[model samples]
Target: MEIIGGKEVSPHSRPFMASIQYGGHHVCGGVLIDPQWVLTAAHCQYRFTKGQSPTVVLGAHSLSKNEASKQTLEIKKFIPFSRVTSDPQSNDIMLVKLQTAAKLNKHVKMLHIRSKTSLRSGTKCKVTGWGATDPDSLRPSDTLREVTVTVLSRKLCNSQSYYNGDPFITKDMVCAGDAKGQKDSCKGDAGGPLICKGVFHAIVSGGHECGVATKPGIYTLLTKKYQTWIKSNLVPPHTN
Candidate 1:
């Protein structure tokens, strides 16, 4: 996903960042919520096929450079929300199980996630990704980038002036961006984390033209139900 009007992040500062890759190229962004599980958007599942799974790259700062801190691992399973549909605003959350646990260190750590009873409309949040920097770019950025955006009320986001009340923003989604069309999470940023007050709160789903006014980025909120889904899915199946 692209981070329009964003700047390069400090190297290895986002310890919980995960780069979901296919054929060595970044496809989407994720958060390492556990040693062996990642939280991301369900739409990203399209990047893989039968017998072909995307690898998760952890502790990465630059996708173009071979960083010593990077830990590449295979994916064991992709547990996406069963109700996900063509509608981007639907249940877009997913939990990916890694083949093995990630070794934690100063450059790699698990991020804590919690359900926000109610995220204030004006609350500020940070979104980071290795996605494209512009709407026209087909390739994602080499270095990680971040942008700060204010949360927009769902009512306003779905109003006639904004989304026009067609594909309504569900309660499971959150809207955030600059109303003037200055900054946003654009193409290639799907499944990336939306950090609010140091907690993983949402997943980038999709948006209209990158950074356009009144068309802010839409994300799948980590509500109590989704958080419970993540926990239940993380449990290891009974093995005889």
Candidate 2:
């Protein structure tokens, strides 16, 4: 079964979930925006590496030992910025095209679509996944997790890091959480969801390896940035 997130997606609600396994472990998860294309963090693609045997799970919820209504699909493509790196995590978005579409079983459902207009100036959002509750730990649990975070100004995000000592963020990327020491993405939860306006706008990427207080987490922005690619790759639900 393709596991998008470790948590169980009530088959009644969400149809597709994003999950990847490497080194005999399932480290990251994501959302199936389209039947064939799964949206997830570019970092996961980076960390998991190419030529790795990563499987995309669709039409299922939990990745536990139990038999949940889900199945796994071998990835047909691994697409990311050819120059994507770890430091800036620039071009930190990736899409996996599934070899086969999933069948809707009792426990599998699709997620709602996010709007292009909702990501304007001051929209509130959340990042949900099995990432570390803190930034330091590399291990993620099997249970589902969700965290509240707010969207940042595209300008502020692309402007400069708090230190201004690093390179600039970009429009295709999104930064969330704040310096208030509030909860944010941790280690385990990568390629999760940055839900916005009842839709998913970004897949959780890593931020501030420090995972320290008040630091923001990075998410892959879903906008005109990938419009052309998304258009070419996406598969409409219930259709070929």
Candidate 3:
């Protein structure tokens, strides 16, 4: 998915950003939460073929250009939330284990994941990815891009005017987008990070439509429950 109405980000500025690629093409976005663990959306698993696995590229700015800062690793396993259902909005979170731990460097660092049980409505946040710039084109951008968005009240998001009481807007999800229908995350951005106040708050899940009025982007909020789940799944560093 792409970031609508966002500018290209500086090279390697977002060290935690990751590009999940299949067949050498960017399929989704992920965030490096630990040296060996990446957090993304559960729906991203469907993007792969039966036998095809994805490659995680860290410290990347441009997907088309090979840069010295990039570290590519194979996926060891994908652990999707046990409660995830066919509904894209149902616990749309997942953890990706790398075959090998990433070497922390100037260009590759882990993001701080802080559980945010509640975010104030209208709070500013940032969403970044290499997703498509335009919904029609559906072509992902080579360079990373970012857009600032404001959080919306869950009540408003599910009210009659918006999602119209969509049962999928559960307590574990967050709603955010531009009120003017200008900025949002589009295709190829699923599983990306939603940073608020410098904290990894949510995972880019799905929505009604990209950059559409009254249809904000929904995310898998990193609440205490999910945070605890992540910690339990993380493998300890080698003792030897």
Candidate 4:
């Protein structure tokens, strides 16, 4: 699905939204879980110089317009899940630690995370990003956009009738969108959040096509199944 029917959201609407960029180009979206740690997708990983690993831009809707509320922080380290290369389906998530803790305010805040609850199918969720408004778009949106989606069950998402039994839609992944494909997060929206009930449930993963009928967008589910893995690599507040 695509951001076909969504509306432009205010910069403060999703305060935890993060624009992960290299140089001045927006690469992907992320969520600020803490002052020093950012949760994003492993696929957003790209080659860059040590000094220019990537910058985390927060608290702004427009990428080109540097509003006073915006905060851009250089990444101190890039930590991708170990199995992403071999298991993109299950390990699509990653964490970025910033050189300095972010200065929090009304426009920039940490998003609450939930890894222990059962996020049932059909639960309403929101995906926010600067991704393309359409499939044919040449570039991402200048202003942040948001779209509503519903969670799909693993059985229906991976069934032979749906994605034709795609191997990438593993249990660790969460599927969202409609069979008609009226709404979704598209290109440049990867590593973005799939938030429901104040908890970040998933990170944008991948799909065969955007807004295609019967094909929903996939995301890395931040569930209790992977809770241990997430904590194992996260940097402690005191150490970093």
Candidate 5:
């Protein structure tokens, strides 16, 4: 149950969290890093089309509620890494440029990104999303859900006894999950941020199952490699 064991969080609790929609349908979550740029997973880029631009909804709590705090904007462009392709491990990060700057307020803010890549194993981090509550569900939650999870070392996650022998996880990936297999992100939650303290350290990428034993959730590590690319793409620069 839940985005496996997540519960509904307060309204505007995650000001930088974004609900991305394609053709007015919720597709994935995103993190606003600036008035004009939203960071998300590269896999989400494949859902875009010329005429049907995805919409980014900000500062919203309940998906069914049209509150004044909500700001919706059209996506101007999407920038995915050159190496990004059908492969899940080929840098799963992406940025979406907005048609115009979003109006920031108490209910809308940008997330601070971590410059360093490393988060110690077992450190607790928060993940928020409007993804499905159950594995068999076809629809997303009406309200955003938040969950706390522990980081898992790459060695443990990639060990033969854990993720099989393939070890698809790479240096650019982050692995985290609940040891009891009760809390984690799921389908429709891709592109969401893994927040440690107040900064974003990872981007939800892929996983074997929603939340199961021996199957940890994998994310795109926001390491120096991605930070460099993001800094280069910022039109002027990141601001407060």
Candidate 6:
């Protein structure tokens, strides 16, 4: 399957109905969880203070609103992981609740955390968004393009040559992306989804660009650990 980015990421298209945005500009990548919420990068919010307005484009896989149908989710609140730090590439998950519930439509719907899969090391996956292939690139693309990435073993991730950071990567975390350094997740893809098995189980957070050859994308593994917090902040529909 082709990995779609924020540029082409459309709710009217296939799966998730969300896109990450910063400074009223391009998408950083996002995930559609339900009618009222979208999952994006904490770093995007980290760039602003608590009260500033952050925008999220939903309902389309493509960036151009004219190319497809879309809805905008206002950042009523910025909910970050309790453990997130001040680092640029740390705990990158954030919840953007809509001012009102997103208008439910066939083209748009929510993605389930992997209920049927247990993410293991060496798992092959995909991360899609409009982020630059590299940080210094001039501009983030408007076309949604996705890149194929893979999971690296923790032993390799925690190695000094790779994630020399804290290895704060938890069960709530997953490590993926290319090993050859040819394909990767970049700056604008902060809040994008890391998909495997038709389920969105990881949230793109941060990683070592220097050792991207070793660790391409460092993700927040959407394992059982993050369930409570995700639902609570996202305010999932109260099911009986």
TM-score of 2: 0.77
Tens digits of per-residue lDDT for model 4, 1-240: 332556799657888999999877897999998888889988787844555557899888898986999998988888877762564455877899888989999999998678576789989888888878777776888889988888888888777767666554677787888646334566788888988887788888743356676777887888765567668766465543
Candidate 4 residue 96 C-alpha distance from true site, Å: 0.5
Quantify all predictions' global Cα lDDT against the true fold.
0.81, 0.62, 0.82, 0.79, 0.80, 0.65
What TM-score do all the candidates reach, one by one? Answer: 0.91, 0.77, 0.92, 0.90, 0.90, 0.81
lDDT of 6 by residue, 159-233 (tens): 676666566555566567555533365656667788876778788774334124554567777665567778677
Question: Pick by lDDT: which candidate is best?
Answer: 3
User: Which of 1 and 3 is ahead in lDDT?
Assistant: 3
Of 2 and 3, the candidate ranking higher by lDDT: 3
Per-residue lDDT tens digits of candidate 5, residues 21-57? 8877777899999889999988776544666657889
> Which wins on TM-score, candidate 5 or candidate 6?
5
Error of 3 at 112 (Å): 1.3
Q: Per TM-score, what order, best first? A: 3, 1, 5, 4, 6, 2
**Residue 209 of model 4, lDDT score:** 53
Q: Show how many residue pairs clash in every candidate, following the order shown.
A: 3, 22, 7, 1, 0, 30
lDDT tens readout by residue for model 1, 1-240: 543487889999999999988777887899999899999988778643675557999999999898989999998888888773566567877888999999999999998887554678889899899767777888888889898888988888888877877668878888888746244655668888888887777888844457567678888888877988887876774347
Q: State the lDDT at 121 in candidate 2.
A: 50
Query: Which 10 successive residues of model 1 have the least lDDT summed?
Result: 179-188
